[PDB]
């Protein structure tokens, strides 16, 4: 018991932080999706104006 108590620990904070990183990278994914979408329409708009 004493040796196993010395042994056992961890990885819950790591699970949560990895979920946090998933969250942040999904945030950036959608931000860049919106930026790309904003820039896409202007291409056809400017071709049409030309």
């Amino acid at each position: 018991n004493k040796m196993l108590q010395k042994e056992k620990e961890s990885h819950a904070k790591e699970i949560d932080e990895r979920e946090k990183t998933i969250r942040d990278k999904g945030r950036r994914i959608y931000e860049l999706k919106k930026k790309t979408q904003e820039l896409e329409k202007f291409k056809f708009v400017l071709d049409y104006k030309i």
Partner: protein, 48 residues
């Protein structure tokens, strides 16, 4: 990010020809011109 990069120039540049075509038109419509002065002066010649 790369798609937005490949689309930022598409959002900006063609404004270049947007301005260019109008600027070219600028001197183009202009020639409502000396042909009319000729028609006026030859009309004066007709008068006399």
């Amino acid at each position: 990010k790369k798609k937005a990069q490949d689309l930022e120039k598409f959002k900006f540049v063609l404004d270049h020809k947007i301005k260019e075509l109008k600027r070219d038109i600028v001197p183009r419509e202009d020639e409502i011109t000396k042909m009319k002065q000729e028609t006026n002066n030859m009309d004066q010649y007709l008068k006399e």
